[PDB]
């Protein structure tokens, strides 16, 4: 919503453990 | 050349000495070579021992060759041509030496030469190399192919670049003759070569595609693994770029790939398995699989078990059959959606409850893999499966525990949507326990999974906040370094989920000290700052004033990191050959943390900014080539504008033209943040904004009428246009007819807050200045006003003044017919508030 977009959440998703 | 005995004896002596078991002889041999390598003539001796000195044993000849190789990759610029040409000559002349070790050494030399310097500087390498394929001696053609293969691997693009006169128009049509070749090695080289130029859609290959494909099939019957492996990846690549060409053979191809996927040789199977992964991206997937799908699913499912070696290794990680199969299943689930469930549920029943842990673990994986695609179809089964998975969290096998964490996390949406006490509560409870597992893989799996859950739950976590923090804090003292990184991420997302609820003296006191502690350990060049800083960013925003006792050093370090990054970049820009380009992520994370600090503290960041050059640093950031850098800087700009505008005002005249050149929707979040920023500066500028409006308005209007534009960009664009109009109705109100529709469509859907208030004040002022600008599209305005739940009294009066104004303009009759089209809620609302 109205306000700034950041990539923080996305950066955390990239670092998150995944089996594949 | 000029090898003399004295010289040769000395180098051989040194080569013998380098092969000494003695450790001290080694250290002094190192320094002896250290000096000699800088003497180009020395290199002449090195190649001579490799290629000419038959007397010497193989490890001696080859080591000479390898030392030379290192020289050719740290000193090659400083080679004169006379030595270079002697090496080049000597290599190609010995490419097929009957010793495999010599052959390999000669090979690395050729390819390393081509690599490091020879780029185009070796004009006749490729041509001679190609003709060397036609040669008689087996080793000779083998050696030449090996070289070519390697050249294509790191050189791939030799065509697409055209720095040499289109050389690939000769090579590619030359490899496929050797597909036919009697020896397995040569076949492989040939295919492995061609393969390099498929995804690039290489001209030479694309207009030779039939010859390729025909020759590939001719190979299908081959049982040599290396050949199978290469054929397999050919087909995979072809599938991505030449779909047209293989349809007519698709049944036979699928049959072939399905066989190889079941190959007992792990490598064949892995290359084969990629086919399914990329096939699932093509729109023709369903049609092509109809005859084979029933076998494919169980085959994928079976390859998703850990291999026997991995089981052993993981008791005491990169791409493999398991990951490929699981990824393929994931995409197939998204393709087939609920149609996949009858294939997969019978397999799940035999896997999920099995007495062999390896089998069970794969079952849980499958269940997780299919979650996104088959979500709707799985709902009926979740009341049973979820409680079962929760139990599995305390399975005695770590590998079962860890995969359960993940699979549960894949069903987080459903869990959160059910009554909290039935699934969420026990799940959260067992995840927290699992965060403190004694096993390190479990720790991260649990921590990753909890974060995912946090994201989904949001405010739903607030009641359990104290209990949550207890565990997360304790983890600080428990975790080694790798897992602390995932932990910061979990804290970060926690802070985002619970917002201001985090602001309690007890929470701050248990949370802050260990965060700063690791902050003090980490140096400015350590990437492990990224997660810590991103974590701090979220905490700061959530804590607001609570962060006061901590801000100063955090503020200083961030500005500083931005400063030194900018410095390093300039230094690299001046002398690239001596100074390393910086990692701009340090700068992105620092800006983003300054943004959070500014959002959190607001006005209370003034004192720090007063003592700072952050704005002069921002000026360069805003002009950076990297979108994410700009994106972060426009965000900070917007934040400082709100928090302490007095320091920003001086810069506006410089800042605006840059904001104006970054209203490009191609970069969504840059465009967004620029847009937001310019809206916030408007409010601070008042009518002083007038000169800057033209450099920005046309574009904003273009963006708000743009199809396939994200919800958030459109919202910010609408607000900003609203804001510009509020301070300068005269410059923007003429444009009203062109934006009012999407302006209204976008904003009717947003929460009642300060921004919306601000933007609607603007739209009212503009209507007062250009009412014929709304008349034609008044329903949109009506709907947008009706979206207000609790408008401030003055804003309300503006509304009914415009509404009353319009009804009076068209008369009781036209009005009643216009208001006929009102949905009931709308018709009703503008009598509760507006009496229309």
UniProtKB/Swiss-Prot annotation, chain A:
Residues 5-20 have a biased composition (Basic and acidic residues). Changing residue 15 to C: In ALS6; results in aberrant trafficking and cytoplasmic retention of the protein. Phosphorylated in its N-terminal serine residues upon induced DNA damage. ATM and DNA-PK are able to phosphorylate FUS N-terminal region. It is found in: Nucleus. Ubiquitous. Self-oligomerizes (via N-terminal region). Oligomerization is essential for chromatin binding. Component of nuclear riboprotein complexes. Interacts with ILF3, TDRD3 and SF1. Interacts through its C-terminus with SFRS13A. Interacts with OTUB1 and SARNP. Interacts with LRSAM1. Interacts with SAFB1 in a DNA-dependent manner; this interaction tethers FUS to chromatin. Interacts with MATR3. Interacts with SNRNP70 and POLR2A; these interactions couple RNA transcription and splicing. DNA/RNA-binding protein that plays a role in various cellular processes such as transcription regulation, RNA splicing, RNA transport, DNA repair and damage response. Binds to ssRNA containing the consensus sequence 5'-AGGUAA-3'. Binds to nascent pre-mRNAs and acts as a molecular mediator between RNA polymerase II and U1 small nuclear ribonucleoprotein thereby coupling transcription and splicing. Also binds its own pre-mRNA and autoregulates its expression; this autoregulation mechanism is mediated by non-sense-mediated decay. Belongs to the RRM TET family. It is linked to A chromosomal aberration involving FUS is found in a patient with malignant myxoid liposarcoma. Translocation t(12;16)(q13;p11) with DDIT3. This is RNA-binding protein FUS. It comes from Homo sapiens. The chain holds residues 507 to 526 of 526 of the full protein.
Swiss-Prot record, chain B:
The keyword Zinc does not apply. GO terms for cellular component: cilium; cytoplasm; cytosol; extracellular exosome; nucleolus; nucleoplasm; nucleus. GO terms for molecular function: nuclear import signal receptor activity; nuclear localization sequence binding; RNA binding; small GTPase binding. It is found in: Cytoplasm; Nucleus. HEAT repeats lie at residues 7-34, 39-77, 86-119, 125-162, 169-199, 212-239, 251-278, 343-371, 383-410, 424-457, 465-498, 506-544, 552-603, 614-645, 653-686, 694-729, 737-770, 779-810, 813-833. Keywords: Acetylation, Cytoplasm, Host-virus interaction, Nucleus, Protein transport, Repeat, Transport. Changing residue 676 to A: Abolishes interaction with the ADAR nuclear localization signal. Abolishes ADAR nuclear import. Its main location: cytoplasm. Identified in a complex that contains TNPO1, RAN and RANBP1. Binds HNRPA1, HNRPA2, HNRNPDL, RPS7, RPL5 and RAN. Interacts with H2A, H2B, H3 and H4 histones. Interacts with isoform 1 and isoform 5 of ADAR/ADAR1 (via DRBM 3 domain). Interacts with SNAI1 (via zinc fingers); the interaction mediates SNAI1 nuclear import. Interacts with SNAI2 (via zinc fingers). Interacts with RPL23A (via BIB domain) and SRP19; this interaction is involved in RPL23A and SRP19 import into the nucleus. This is Transportin-1. It comes from Homo sapiens (Human).
